[PDB]
């Protein structure tokens, strides 16, 4: 499915920074009105300081649409996961903590269930052609491959992985990992500049396609994206 996405800073919709206004709820409602079955939010305020996690806003947004929302941004602790779920989010998106503390995160899978968690991994293809995991675009590689990290979590029932390519190559990347782990539903993130980019991901095996900036830029609509995806 198409997964429309917003990044939020202090109640403001931003592009990665350009301000697109303070109306995230009507934006999300219109995404759902066009047929979206899942939405994605990044709490950039929470990511910079978990003390200022935008829980009240997230509550309002989840309540205001009829579809599951997955939410990430500075999820560091079990308390963070619980607080987001309590606010009504469908799934919590875990990023750097899934790389840095796998035994701790494996415990979260046991407590909350695999249906409640999405692991978001940034992947950089190195000189050798290895899929290297990094915790962000501006930090060096972490010394573990995508495959190695996925296999760390398969024993606790990993089901959802969001993969962002931060290094043609894009499509091959998703074809390979989806083929290797058909029991995992992979989501693609990044590299969607126009409608043809969505077409290209078709048949790769990816289950979900995150689309953020291209919608804000008015390149195409959620309805058009879904029609392309469904072919
Ligand atoms: Na966005």
Q: Write down the catalytic residue from 43, 80, 122, 165.
A: 122
Ligand 1 is a single-atom ion; what residues have CB below 5 A from it?
5-6, 212
User: What is the 42 CA–ligand 1 centroid distance (Å)?
Assistant: 9
Elucidated via:
X-ray
Cβ count within 10 A of residue 113: 12
Chain position carrying tokens 């995806």: 229
What is the Å distance from ligand 1's center to 146 Cα?
A: 25
Active site residue 10: no
Task: Show the CA angle centred on residue 87, arms to residues 82 and 89, nearest 5°.
Answer: 85
Please, which residues have CB within 8 angstroms of residue 33's CB and are 6 or more apart in sequence? none
Residues 6+ apart with CB under 8 A from 103: none
In angstroms, this model's resolution equals 1.7
Give the number of other Cβ atoms within 10 Å of residue 231's Cβ. Answer: 7
Contact 91, 85 (CB under 8 A): no
Walk me through the domains of the chain, giving residue ranges and CATH numbers: 1-231 (3.20.20.70)
Sequence-distant (6+) residues with CB within 8 A of 1 are 36, 37, 38, 207, 208, 209, 226, 229
Which stretches of the chain are assigned E, i.e. beta strand? Answer: 2-9, 12-15, 18-19, 39-43, 69-72, 91-94, 117-125, 131-134, 160-165, 185-189, 208-211
Dist. CA 119 → ligand 1 center (Å): 19
Rg (CA), the chain: 17
């Amino acid at each position: 499915m198409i997964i429309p996405a917003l990044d939020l800073i202090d109640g403001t919709v931003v592009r990665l920074q350009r301000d697109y206004g303070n109306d995230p709820l009507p934006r999300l409602q219109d995404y759902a009105a066009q047929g979206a079955g899942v939405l994605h939010l990044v709490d950039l305020t929470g990511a910079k300081d978990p003390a200022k996690r935008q829980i009240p806003l997230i509550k309002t947004l989840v309540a205001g649409v009829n579809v599951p929302v997955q939410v990430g941004g500075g999820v560091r602790t079990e308390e963070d996961v619980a607080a987001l779920l309590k606010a009504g989010v469908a799934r919590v998106v875990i990023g750097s903590t899934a790389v840095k503390s796998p035994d701790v995160v494996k415990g979260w899978f046991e407590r909350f269930g695999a249906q409640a968690l999405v692991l978001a991994l940034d992947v950089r293809i190195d000189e050798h052609g290895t899929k290297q995991v990094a915790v962000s675009g501006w930090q060096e590689n972490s010394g573990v491959s995508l495959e190695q990290l996925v296999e760390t979590y398969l024993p606790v029932g990993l089901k959802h992985v969001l993969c962002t390519d931060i290094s043609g190559s894009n499509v091959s990347l998703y074809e390979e990992v989806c083929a290797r782990y058909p029991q995992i539903a992979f989501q693609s993130s990044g590299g969607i500049g126009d409608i043809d980019d969505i077409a290209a991901l078709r048949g790769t095996g990816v289950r979900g396609v995150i689309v953020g900036r291209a919608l804000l830029e008015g390149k195409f609509t959620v309805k058009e994206a879904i029609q392309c995806w469904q072919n």
